[PDB]
């Protein structure tokens, strides 16, 4: 009953239908990053008894980010050659 | 992308389907080979 649905709702056959019904302009990129931040915020943070997990996630995410950034310079000391 | 598809898929359809079936295979082979060679040189310089 709807053209645009949550990408999980849509099927594989109409997969490209979803890919083409949606927009791509940078404004529609900010209007996505914002939605992500605000889902996280209003679901795990903006609550009267926020906990560690309300924060630890972004930290342990930034961690993996800056680990991926560094993969190149770390292929030079693998303790074993044939992995 | 609608202008894009309506500029490069109306005319160029009968070619990619009927004729050029046999060149895409070749391009896959090309990808195979380039992968192999880049991997080989990456290996040999990872050594030094």
């Amino acid at each position: 009953p709807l053209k645009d649905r949550r990408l999980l709702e849509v099927k594989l056959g109409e997969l490209p239908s979803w890919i083409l019904m949606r927009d791509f302009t940078p404004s529609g990129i900010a209007g996505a990053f914002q939605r992500g931040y605000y889902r996280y915020y209003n679901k795990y943070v903006n609550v009267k008894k926020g906990s560690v997990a309300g924060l630890s996630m972004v930290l342990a995410a930034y961690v993996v980010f800056n680990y991926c950034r560094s993969y190149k310079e770390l292929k030079h000391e693998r303790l074993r050659k044939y992995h | 992308l609608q202008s894009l598809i309506k500029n490069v898929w109306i005319p160029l359809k009968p070619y990619y389907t009927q004729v050029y079936q046999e060149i895409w295979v070749g391009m896959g082979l090309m990808g195979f080979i380039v992968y192999k060679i880049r991997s080989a040189d990456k290996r040999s310089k990872a050594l030094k």
Partner: protein, 34 residues
Amino acid sequence: MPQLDTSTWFITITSMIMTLFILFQLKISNYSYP
């Protein structure tokens, strides 16, 4: 031989493709007959 610093092969190839099998097949596909 800088044709052997393989770093760039991917892009060169892909762009060659994009050109040889898109643009000209658009332009020349429009030329006409006497």
